[PDB]
Structure formats: C-alpha cells, structure tokens
Design a binder for this molecule. Structure first.
Ligand SMILES: *[C@@H]1O[C@H](CO)[C@@H](O[C@@H]2O[C@H](CO)[C@@H](O)[C@H](O)[C@H]2NC(C)=O)[C@H](O)[C@H]1NC(C)=O
Ligand SMILES: [Zn+2]
Length: 323
C-alpha cells in the first residue's frame, strides 16, 4: 500500500511558454481588493469578526468553477478566560483521492485589549497568507478542475482558528485549532475504512505560511526532510527573475535562502510535524519589523512581494501535481 509512496515524489517542471502564461494569470490588485482587504478587521475567536471572515471565505471558494468540498471543524476549549469556541476551515478538491498537497494559513487575529478606537488587524500576521492561498486557486482555477477521472493526489486548504494565545503564549494557551486537528486527522481513516490508514497518512506536504507582507523578507529551511523541495524555491526563484517575471526584485537579495538549520520557531505546524509529517515553514525571519505592534497594517505592506511570491508556488503547487 501507498502510505510510503509520498516520499518518492518529484515534480513536473513546465516551460517558459507556460511559465509566462500565469505570471500574467494573476493580479495582485484583484487580490488586494476581493480577497484580502475585506478581512482587514478583528478576526480572533468569539468575535463578530471570526465570522465576517470565515463566512467571507466559504463562497470565495465555492463560487469557483473548480471542485471544492468545504468543512467547518468547530469545538470548545479552555481559554484563560473560560470556554470560548473555535472554528477550523477545511477546503478540499477530490476528498476520495488519498494524498494531498495542502497549504494552510492561520485565519484568526490576535486579541488585543481595548483602550482606544485603534485596534489590531494583522496584515502580514496573517491575512496576507490566506489571501494568496485564495489567489492561488483562483488564478489557476481550471488547471485544478482538470483532474476529474479521478494517482490519488490533490489539494487541501486549511485555515486554522486560534493561532495565538490570549494573555500569554503557552503549550496550552496557543494553537487550539492546530492540535485539535491532528488527533482528529489522526483518529479518522481514509480510505473509509482502511485499517492502519487515517487522515494524517495522505498529507503529502504542508506549507504553512505566516508573517507574510513586509518589504524584504527571508525564509530559512528548517527540515532537510522537505528541503529537497525547498530546492524548488531555490530553483523557481531564479529560472524566473532571469526572465524578468519579477518586479522590483533582485537575486542578490534572495529570501528563499539556505543556512538557518533546525531552528526553534513555533507555529500551528509543530503538532503535525509531530506525527513525523514532512512540513515546510515559511515566515519572514526576522519577523516583520512591526510584528504585533498596532502598526501591523496596510501602510507597511508591499504588493510586489506578495505577488512575485504569489506566482512562484502557483508553480511549485503545479510541479508537485504533474502539471
Ligand atoms: C510547454 O509545455 C506544453 C506541454 O506541457 C506544450 O504545449 C502542449 O503540448 C501538448 C500537445 O500534445 C499538449 O500537452 C497541449 O495540448 C499543449 N498545450 C498547452 C496549452 O500547453 C508547449 O508547446 C511547451 N512549450 C515549449 C516547449 O516551448
Ligand atoms: Zn501573531
């Protein structure tokens, strides 16, 4: 049986001709204004916000001509203030297929106390992620639809709710969603019901994205596990600025750069990675120079980036999936 095939996969590099067509088949002003901004509001749990968002998504997907199958995992937990609810979102093309490329932001904000009209939002941290993840199945829509035949392998999106700790980051004041997804992924098997094959077996990669939207970032590579793939972003990022599908960018300041090895950063990803899942963690390091200050907004953003960085994986994602 499969479960071990996951670790043989290598991609289909396309050519310029194609490489052109969807460096132009993406508009980061379309993203800015349909996907992104109408999330720029306070969207941590309990909040009127944690719905205007959640909901916002849902149709943002399904409105699409491709093939998504959308699930709200929702549950009740221990907040250092009591028993708030939580709502993980789970987009899915080909559910029956049984190995998946998946991308996954945190869809919530930080709670921040209320002493004036000003209020947190989190641009970079992190609606920017989700926003691309949204671009990323718009732009390449029908390419994604073109696969109903129907080996087993497709595309899961995930939006974790409860990235952050209320008062105080801890092993048990944080990640709420993430963890609750693991032993729920783990519990349940697909095939339904292939005995020693649950949901955590078909998770092919996991490219978690956080802190995305500053000028001039740098992403380590943490897990050699998945750096063979990191190599793809070495690779994409050059066969590419060369041909100049890249604005306001040079390769003597690369962000997909290789040295920050086996390092102590703790997102939503840890407990997945801790059923040995191969995970890929991508996250301006050092942190956007405004992280969490009230100043984590539009202002200090930068189209360019997001974008360029929006293409890029809209290749990898392919590649992987033999387009
Ligand atoms: C770029 O790659 C594609 C193949 O992925 C080439 O065009 C395709 O070629 C075959 C014809 O049998 C089919 O896969 C498609 O019908 C073609 N169309 C499209 C739209 O991709 C294309 O010629 C290659 N470009 C080069 C080599 O410059
Ligand atoms: Zn944060």
């Amino acid at each position: 049986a499969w479960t071990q095939e996951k670790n043989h996969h290598q991609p289909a590099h396309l050519n310029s001709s194609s490489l052109q067509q969807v460096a132009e088949g993406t508009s980061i002003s379309e993203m800015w204004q349909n996907d992104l901004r109408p999330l720029l509001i306070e969207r941590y749990p309990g909040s009127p916000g944690s719905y205007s968002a959640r909901q916002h998504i849902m149709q943002r997907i399904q409105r699409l001509q491709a093939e998504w199958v959308v699930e709200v995992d929702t549950f009740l937990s221990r907040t250092p203030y009591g028993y708030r609810s939580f709502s993980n979102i789970i987009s899915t093309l080909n559910p029956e297929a049984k190995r998946h490329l998946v991308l996954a932001c945190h869809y919530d904000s930080k709670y921040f106390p209320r002493w004036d009209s000003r209020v947190f939002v989190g641009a970079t941290d992190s609606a920017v992620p989700c926003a691309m993840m949204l671009e990323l199945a718009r732009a390449l829509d029908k390419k994604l639809h073109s696969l109903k035949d129907v080996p087993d392998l497709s595309l899961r999106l995930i939006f974790f709710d409860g990235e952050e700790a209320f008062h105080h980051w801890s092993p048990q004041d944080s990640l709420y969603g993430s963890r609750h997804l693991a032993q729920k992924m783990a519990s349940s098997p697909h095939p339904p019901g292939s005995r020693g094959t649950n949901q955590l077996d078909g998770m092919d990669l996991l490219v978690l994205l956080d802190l995305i939207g500053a000028a001039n970032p740098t992403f380590p590579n943490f897990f050699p596990k998945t750096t063979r793939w990191f190599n793809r972003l070495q690779a994409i990022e050059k066969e590419l600025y060369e041909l100049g599908l890249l604005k306001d960018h040079s390769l003597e300041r690369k962000y997909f750069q290789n040295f920050g090895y086996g390092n102590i950063i703790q997102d939503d990803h840890i407990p997945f990675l801790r059923k040995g899942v191969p995970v890929l963690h991508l996250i301006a390091s050092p942190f956007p120079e405004v992280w969490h200050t009230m100043d984590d907004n539009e202002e200090n953003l930068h189209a360019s980036t997001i974008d360029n960085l929006n293409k890029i994986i809209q290749v990898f994602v392919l590649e992987y999936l033999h387009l």
